[PDB]
Each structure stands twice: as C-alpha cells, then as structure tokens.
Design a protein around this ligand. Structure first.
Ligand SMILES: O=C1Nc2ccccc2/C1=C\c1cccc(C(=O)O)c1
Ligand SMILES: O=C1Nc2ccccc2/C1=C\c1cccc(C(=O)O)c1
Lengths: 149, 149
C-alpha cells in the first residue's frame, strides 16, 4: 500500500482536472488538461512516477485502462496498471467527497488566480497541508520512509 | 536543510528547462517552458511547494529574485526567497555537473519521445531513481521523515 495510487478525473470550467491520489495518505497531485486523452494520462503518470515510488495505479476508467499509450507509460515507469473498480463501495464515495472538497477549495481561491491551473495548484497545496494530527503531506512521507527502512 | 531547494535554469533545443533541486538529497523536479519568466517561475514554485515542504528557495538569478510575481508566489506558499550566490564555490560546480548529467540522460532517451518535455520527465525519473546505496528519491523521503519526527 505505500506504492498504490488512484487516478481520478473531474470537470470544471469546461476543462478537465486529472488527479492522482495516494490512497493510504490522501496526498494528491493534479493538473489541468483540455481533455482526458491517453497521451495526457500517460505523461501525467510519467511525471508522478519520477517524483514518488509508484508501484500500482488504479486507472479511472476503461478507456485509460485499455489505452496503449497509458500501457506504454506504465511499462516504461515500472507501474502495475490495474482497473479501479471499487471492491469496497466506500471507495468511490471517498473520491466523490474529494472532488467536492477540491472544487470547494478552488472556489475559495478562484479570484486570486486568472488561470484555472493556478487555482488548482493552490488547492493541491491547501489540501496537502491541511492538518486532520498530521497532514496528507506528512503522512505520505512517513508511510514511504517506514517502507524504505 | 530539509526545506532548502535551489532553482536552476538550463537550455536545450531552443527551450528552457527549469529545475528545482533539493540540496540535501539531490532529488529534482523539472519542467520545460518556452522561456524563463517571473510568471512561469512563480507557477513552478507553487507546484513544488504543494508537493514538498519547501521552506527556503535559492533563486537562480537576479531577475527571479527581484520578480514581483515570484515574490508573490513565495509569500502565498510560505517560502523564504533567497539569493543563490555560491558562498561555497563547490555549489555552482555541482549544478553545472547536474545540468550536464541531465542533458546526457535526455540524450539517452531522446528518441523514445517526440516532445522534449517527455524526455525531460524520463530524465527526472532516471535521475531520482539512480542508486549511488540510496537513490535521491529515497534520501529526500528519509530526510523529511526524520525532520517530522
Ligand atoms: O502574483 C502572484 N501571486 C501568486 C501566488 C501563487 C502563484 C502564482 C501567483 C502570482 C501570479 C501568477 C503567476 C502565474 C499565473 C497566475 C495566474 O493568475 O494564473 C498568477
Ligand atoms: O507510448 C508511450 N511510451 C511512453 C513512456 C513514457 C511516457 C509517455 C509514453 C508514450 C507516449 C507518449 C505520451 C505523451 C507524449 C509522448 C511524446 O512522444 O512526447 C509520448
């Protein structure tokens, strides 16, 4: 579980926000893209796996699961690509809740940024630093550090 | 020193590669931009600080040190912005060496990617995973985890 991430795609202002959630910690990375393509998803995963030790990715839908470009990026980066079917039904609900929370934060910062991408990165910052006590940022580092030792 | 990062700007294929190096570990994040502007640097730092606990940034040049947009992003994200003048002359040489090493890796992967940005992220991946025995990715996590406890 230190290496397990979940992909999540949500929509705002006619654009797409692609999110990777580290399941065990709640830590996220996100980007704005014009639309969800295999190529964009592939590039996003390459960035993620260069930054964190990504072992398994639960893909967000069947198109990205099937995508040859996504499969190539997962091969390149040593990621086991899996489906994202909630065998636990409380899982989708947690993502649903996270998308709602992220959009709430985006709303709270939206006027401080001209471009949506800036607001999204402010929201990532706030999300990862929020103490719940540890923050998601603290939890992911502790989880992975423990795993290394 | 767990929170200290150094900005570095290098050039390839008529484009600019902006790099943030975590000084204590050698871990890097990087992006390709058309040219180094205050706005691009500001956005890059916002992304970085949402992902890692960035306390201090040594800026790469006087224009970014002076930039009102960079100063605003540092204020927003709780980053102490400093100059990047090598009080130790072995510092610049280490960055010089890193740029050369990064460009070497980019060369080694360049044909596997159409776009430079893909090659750069492959290079970030290889750099951060290389065992030298721990990798830069392992070192940054251990450093920050120790600091939290
Ligand atoms: O001055 C600034 N405060 C910031 C605090 C955080 C991040 C950026 C800024 C920033 C300017 C900036 C730079 C790029 C894009 C955008 C945008 O409006 O999308 C604004
Ligand atoms: O099939 C693929 N293998 C990969 C291994 C790693 C990353 C991407 C790919 C990938 C395709 C892809 C996707 C986006 C851009 C580019 C580009 O050429 O810049 C290529």
């Amino acid at each position: 579980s230190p290496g397990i991430w979940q992909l999540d795609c949500t929509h705002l202002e006619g654009k797409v926000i692609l999110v990777a959630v580290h399941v065990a910690s709640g830590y996220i990375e996100a980007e704005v893209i014009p639309a969800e393509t295999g190529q964009e998803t592939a590039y996003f995963l390459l960035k993620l796996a260069g930054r964190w030790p990504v072992k398994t990715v639960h893909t967000d839908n069947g198109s990205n699961f099937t995508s040859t470009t996504v499969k190539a990026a997962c091969w390149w980066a040593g990621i086991k690509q899996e489906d994202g079917i909630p065998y636990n039904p409380q899982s989708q609900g947690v993502i649903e809740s996270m998308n709602k929370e992220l959009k709430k934060i985006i709303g709270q910062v939206r006027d401080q940024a001209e471009h949506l991408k800036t607001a999204v990165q402010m929201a990532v910052f706030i999300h990862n630093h929020k103490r719940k006590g540890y923050s998601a940022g603290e939890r992911i580092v502790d989880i992975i550090a423990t795993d290394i030792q």
